[PDB]
């Protein structure tokens with residue numbers, strides 16, 4: 001109940017300003033999203049360029065503002081393909097200063113994958129469920145359906 005109240009307070013002060021996917025090697029922006037993907041209760045959509053799938057290393061840039069302080073801001077992202085969990089990502093940011101705006105890049109450094117699922121198969125069939133936490137406090141759960149265009 002106090003937990004519920006604190007979570008809603010954080011969420012009220014929180015905005016995802018933008019998300020970019022970048023080519024980590026060149027810094028080139030491959031996709032820019034400006035919808036607040038952190039808002040719960042709606043299915044958001046992202047139309048990402050199919051060329052993403054052949055990019056050797058993709059950094060995820062999130063820029064977010066928070067009126068509230070957070071001790072351990074972090075994300076859990078579960079990627080579903082046709083209802084079934086394909087992969088899981090966990091990204092910790094850490095301590096967030098009250099009234100701050102922060103640019104956050106995340107990279108999972110791994111071997112590029114030469115064998116991928118077709119864009120035509122992925123598109124519209126991928127949902128990313130993101131849980132926004134401060135430590136163990138769940139602030140928000142959003143869903144984004146991916147199209148590869």
Ligand SMILES: *C/C=C(\C)CC/C=C(\C)CCC=C(C)C
Pocket residue numbers: 019021037038046048052058062128130142144146
């Ligand atoms: C290369 C990364 C891909 C295709 C997944 C990108 C993620 C999204 C688009 C949605 C991210 C959602 C939040 C940050 C809430």
